[PDB]
Amino acid sequence: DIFSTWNISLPSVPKPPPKPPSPPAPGAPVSRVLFLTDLHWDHEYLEGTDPYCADPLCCRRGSGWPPNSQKGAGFWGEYSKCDLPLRTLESLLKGLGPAGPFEMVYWTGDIPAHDVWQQSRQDQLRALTTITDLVRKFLGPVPVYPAVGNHESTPVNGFPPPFIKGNQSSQWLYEAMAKAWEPWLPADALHTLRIGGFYALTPRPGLRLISLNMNFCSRENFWLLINSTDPAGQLQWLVEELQAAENRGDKVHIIGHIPPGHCLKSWSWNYYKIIARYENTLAGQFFGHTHVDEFEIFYDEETLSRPLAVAFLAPSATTFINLNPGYRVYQIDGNYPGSSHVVLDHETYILNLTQANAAGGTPSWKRLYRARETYGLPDAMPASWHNLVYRMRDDEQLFQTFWFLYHKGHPPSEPCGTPCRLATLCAQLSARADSPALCRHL
Ligand SMILES: *[C@@H]1O[C@H](CO[C@@H]2O[C@@H](C)[C@@H](O)[C@@H](O)[C@@H]2O)[C@@H](O[C@@H]2O[C@H](CO)[C@@H](O)[C@H](O)[C@H]2NC(C)=O)[C@H](O)[C@H]1NC(C)=O
Ligand SMILES: *[C@@H]1O[C@H](CO)[C@@H](O[C@@H]2O[C@H](CO)[C@@H](O)[C@H](O)[C@H]2NC(C)=O)[C@H](O)[C@H]1NC(C)=O
Ligand SMILES: *[C@@H]1O[C@H](CO)[C@@H](O[C@@H]2O[C@H](CO)[C@@H](O)[C@H](O)[C@H]2NC(C)=O)[C@H](O)[C@H]1NC(C)=O
Ligand SMILES: [Zn+2]
Ligand SMILES: [Zn+2]
């Protein structure tokens, strides 16, 4: 009973009848949006060190060395509890050309490495500014719209709400974020950013981007043990933004770090009803944090029967843990008046480390897969990802395809049996935390 239950009131405006978007006309323009998340840069990464140490994070000087030099940390990363060297990140931005030009970029937190015990505020800012300047160097004019992750501050997950004031607050972090991201965000967005770490703006006509600070929903944010009731009034603020976009007829993309399924109950539950209320206004939801390729389907609140939205959970750039580095690109309905702004398809690129770390190897980022093609989907709409889940329940060969891509082409040695399957398939339907009914049909 540590966390209380609370409610958020929706405006008196009646909900318009549900009208799921219609597919775009033949040959309509399509925009490409890059999605980066969980870069996790370890400035202490050292090739050849022991990648299987006893500490939380290995592949460092303090991690020691292995007796067999063959078993030492690789040049571009390692398949272990290790984060990325600056090389692989800078190499990621270098090879973006083949991933087509981008209209926008979404960047969703987890920038520092997992060296929690020895991390200072100065170290965190050094990561923020270093990798921000690098991303802006390679993308140039293309704007990047970032979001706050759970590793940005110190201690990890410590994001006090606004009512906690003074030096103990996270104003040292939001202030630096406003300075670092000023080239990318307008003034009104920076104003909100400096306060609660979230903001809203219009990247293009008819679209409204909302970047949420999901640390106010995290079970790990120890600060929320004081008061977990809509910290920073973010959910209430979200309702006002969504309702205002409904009035203007705009569409909304929401971005964040922790997907709403991994949130505290009340936050996740209140979030669930806001989605359902503004299903016509929402055009996309993009999160990260999980480091793995996934998605979460939303249903109508009362009966949990009609799927009405999907949140795409892109995979990490980092290897943590035993993963190939990869990134994501979304194909979205283009920039024209009659656009729905929805996700039409998406692609995933990786860097096969076994080939990049091999003697004489070279890092070449390649497309791992394209969703619709490999899952045989007529589109990327909620109903279509709903069918895919219950399809993977019936046959095994298709789930193994999903399970393989899950791990960015590098799944573990132990196979995923029938108890692992239901757990995985059930998570794809659990966009609302602590809701066992959502998996009744599994
Ligand atoms: C936690 O605080 C809420 C109200 O304030 C919250 O924090 C603000 C800084 C801002 O983020 C708001 O959006 C938040 O809601 C308390 O809610 C009160 O609840 C009583 C009855 O329980 C109600 O009569 C009051 O009107 C509420 N206050 C407001 C401002 O609406 C809540 O009680 C606090 N939690 C605990 C355990 O005390
Ligand atoms: C605000 O709080 C932070 C967190 O404790 C302080 O950070 C430390 O500051 C001292 C200098 O007084 C340094 O020696 C430590 O290395 C800092 N630690 C970390 C983790 O950053 C900071 O000093 C405080 N600021 C003020 C003005 O009191
Ligand atoms: C990453 O690269 C490795 C090495 O090229 C791939 O492993 C090889 O896979 C082929 C068939 O796919 C086998 O015949 C070789 O014996 C494998 N070599 C080694 C050293 O294991 C691996 O499939 C690649 N993975 C991805 C996702 O591209
Ligand atoms: Zn992470
Ligand atoms: Zn995270």
Side-chain angles (χ1 to χ4, degrees):
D1 190 24
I2 39 172
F3 292 110
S4 61
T5 63
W6 45 277
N7 259 17
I8 287 295
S9 58
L10 301 169
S12 299
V13 179
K15 168 166 167 164
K19 181 181 177 188
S22 188
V30 181
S31 59
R32 296 177 59 83
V33 178
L34 181 71
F35 192 87
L36 295 166
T37 183
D38 295 87
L39 275 53
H40 286 294
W41 168 53
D42 186 26
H43 71 295
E44 297 188 26
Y45 186 92
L46 182 58
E47 171 193 20
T49 51
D50 182 18
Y52 311 121
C53 73
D55 306 87
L57 183 65
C58 304
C59 298
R60 311 166 104 202
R61 177 77 175 80
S63 304
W65 285 263
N68 181 226
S69 55
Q70 299 176 343
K71 307 176 185 192
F75 196 63
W76 300 94
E78 190 54 70
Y79 292 129
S80 186
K81 52 190 176 184
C82 297
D83 282 320
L84 297 176
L86 205 285
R87 312 174 173 103
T88 313
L89 292 173
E90 190 175 6
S91 177
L92 189 157
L93 291 318
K94 286 159 117 294
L96 293 172
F102 307 107
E103 185 185 80
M104 305 175 286
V105 181
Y106 296 168
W107 184 18
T108 63
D110 271 359
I111 301 173
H114 293 87
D115 55 322
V116 175
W117 67 96
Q118 54 183 24
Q119 263 171 358
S120 68
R121 299 193 170 182
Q122 208 189 48
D123 291 333
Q124 305 305 73
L125 303 173
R126 176 160 288 100
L128 175 66
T129 54
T130 304
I131 295 173
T132 298
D133 293 341
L134 191 65
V135 170
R136 187 174 60 252
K137 173 192 171 193
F138 286 93
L139 287 169
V142 184
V144 186
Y145 301 110
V148 180
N150 63 285
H151 272 276
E152 266 59 346
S153 78
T154 176
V156 64
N157 307 316
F159 288 84
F163 67 83
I164 283 175
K165 307 222 162 290
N167 183 47
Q168 203 177 19
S169 72
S170 57
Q171 220 183 341
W172 63 274
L173 181 64
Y174 301 155
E175 289 283 5
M177 283 173 170
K179 191 270 180 297
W181 301 340
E182 185 279 344
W184 290 331
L185 312 183
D188 72 316
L190 295 175
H191 178 81
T192 315
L193 180 69
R194 282 186 268 260
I195 300 173
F198 49 84
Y199 61 92
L201 66 311
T202 61
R204 57 186 191 177
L207 182 60
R208 183 74 167 168
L209 185 80
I210 296 172
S211 184
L212 300 178
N213 179 6
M214 304 301 291
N215 292 308
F216 296 143
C217 94
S218 176
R219 316 189 177 100
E220 315 256 40
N221 186 7
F222 55 90
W223 286 110
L224 305 177
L225 297 168
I226 300 171
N227 193 332
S228 61
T229 302
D230 192 14
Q234 190 175 204
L235 251 45
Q236 186 58 54
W237 171 82
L238 177 64
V239 172
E240 299 173 359
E241 292 281 343
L242 294 174
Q243 185 61 57
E246 173 172 297
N247 296 5
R248 295 189 306 269
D250 296 345
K251 300 289 171 172
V252 176
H253 285 171
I254 289 180
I255 65 172
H257 181 59
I258 303 171
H262 297 40
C263 289
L264 291 164
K265 184 176 181 174
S266 290
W267 204 103
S268 176
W269 274 63
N270 281 272
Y271 185 85
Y272 202 72
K273 72 174 181 191
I274 297 170
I275 302 301
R277 164 61 179 83
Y278 299 98
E279 51 171 318
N280 298 338
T281 300
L282 267 161
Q285 291 182 86
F286 315 93
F287 300 96
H289 187 62
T290 64
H291 293 165
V292 78
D293 199 322
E294 275 188 336
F295 53 92
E296 288 179 349
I297 304 171
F298 297 71
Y299 297 85
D300 70 273
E301 183 181 6
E302 184 168 3
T303 64
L304 307 170
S305 54
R306 180 175 61 82
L308 50 79
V310 180
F312 299 108
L313 281 46
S316 64
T318 187
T319 50
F320 207 90
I321 304 173
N322 191 257
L323 298 174
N324 277 320
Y327 54 89
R328 162 70 51 80
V329 183
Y330 290 105
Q331 299 176 220
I332 288 170
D333 200 8
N335 202 346
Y336 61 104
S339 182
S340 59
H341 310 264
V342 301
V343 184
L344 306 179
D345 203 339
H346 68 64
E347 307 166 326
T348 304
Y349 302 76
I350 62 155
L351 166 67
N352 190 344
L353 279 178
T354 35
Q355 285 163 6
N357 289 345
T362 74
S364 288
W365 302 75
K366 322 184 192 197
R367 201 247 301 273
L368 179 62
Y369 80 104
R370 198 235 303 175
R372 293 183 56 202
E373 175 178 336
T374 66
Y375 298 134
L377 304 174
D379 50 33
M381 292 294 291
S384 188
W385 300 100
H386 169 101
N387 303 329
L388 177 64
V389 173
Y390 291 93
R391 285 168 53 203
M392 288 186 293
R393 184 192 66 180
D394 292 30
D395 80 321
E396 279 304 284
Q397 189 183 332
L398 179 53
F399 179 85
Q400 290 303 324
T401 301
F402 177 90
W403 178 258
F404 175 77
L405 303 169
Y406 196 75
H407 299 263
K408 285 176 282 173
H410 193 261
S413 60
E414 183 179 7
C416 174
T418 174
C420 159
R421 254 194 313 165
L422 303 176
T424 304
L425 300 178
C426 172
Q428 313 308 304
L429 310 175
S430 297
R432 189 173 70 189
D434 189 38
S435 304
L438 282 170
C439 294
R440 60 205 157 173
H441 304 296
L442 291 163

